[PDB]
Structure 1
C-alpha cells in the first residue's frame, strides 16, 4: 500500500531519493540488455558467465514428455504402499506373498538408487531401473518386473 512507501517520506525533499548531481534520467546506459558485450560486459561475465554464443545441437520440433520418465528413489519407494497396509508387509517379510508396487501407476518412470530399504522383499513393476536400484531390491529378496 501507498502510505508505507518511501516516496511518501520524500515529500518535501528535492529530487526524491535520486541525487542532485546525476539526477534520475530516462535510460542512461541504454534500454534493456544493451551493451552486454561492451559497457555492461563486466556485469555479464561474473553473474552470467556463458551468456553469449551457442552450444550443443539444435533439436527440431522437440516434444517434451517424449522424455517423460519421472524418477523415484529406493530412499522412499515404500511410500507408494498405503500407510495402513504398510506395517503388515513390513512385519511379514515373505517371498510367498510380497507387495506389488506398480511405479508407473504412481506416476514414476524410473527407479533410482538413493537410500537403503528394509530387508522385506518387494515386487517392483517398473520401466527403467538403475543398476544399483535393482541390486538393492534383490539383496532384500525383491525383484524388478519390467513393464510399460
Structure 2
C-alpha cells in the first residue's frame, strides 16, 4: 500500500532521496544489458561468469519428454507403499510374499541408491536402476525387474 512507502516520507524533501548531485536521470548507464563487455564488465565477470560465449553443441527440435526420467532414492523407496500396509510388510520380512513396488506407476523412471533400506525383500519394478541401488535391493533380499 502507498501509505507505507518511502514516497510519503520523502514529501517536503527536494531530491526525493535521489541526491542533489547525482540527480536521478533517465538511463545514465544505458538500457537493459547495455555495456556488458565494456562498462559493466566488472559486474558481469564478478557475478555472472560464463555469460558470454558459446559452449557445447546444438540440439535442433529437442523434446523434453524424451528425457523424462524422475529419480527415486532407496531411502524414499518405502514411501511408495501406503502407510497402512507399510508396517505389516516391515514386520515378517518374507521372500515368498514380498511387496511389489511399481515405481513407473508412482511416476519414476530410475531408482537411485542413496541407500539403507530395511533388510526386507521387495520386488522393485523400474525402467532404469543404478548399480548400487540394485546391489542394495539384492542385499536386502529383493529383486529388480525391468519394465518398459
Question: TM-score with structure 1 length normalisation?
Answer: 0.99
- Decide whether the 8 Å contact of 2:115 with 2:133 is kept in 1: no
Write the distance in 2 (CA, Å) between the matches of 1:18 and 1:31. Answer: 19
- 1:56 and 1:34 mapped to 2: Cα distance? 26
Structure 2 counterparts to residues 118-137 of structure 1, below 5 A: 118-137=118-137
* Secondary structure of 2:85's aligned partner: helix
What's the TM-score, normalizing by structure 2?
A: 0.99
Q: Deviations over 1:73-125 (max 9, x none)?
A: 00110000000000111101010000000000000000000031110000001
Q: Secondary structure at the match of 2:67?
A: coil
Q: Output the CA distance in 2 between the equivalents of 1:124 and 1:55.
A: 39
C-alpha offsets along residues 44-76 of structure 1, whole Å, 9 cap, x if unaligned? 001100000000000000000100000000011
Aligned partner of 1:58 in structure 2 is 58
Post-superposition shift, 1:22? 1.1
Output the aligned Cα RMSD: 0.5
Task: Verify the 8 A CA contact 2:90 2:120 in the aligned structure 1.
Answer: yes
Kept in 1, the 8 Å contact 2:127–2:146? The answer is: yes
The answer for unaligned runs of 5 or more in structure 2 is none
Structure number with higher helix proportion: 2
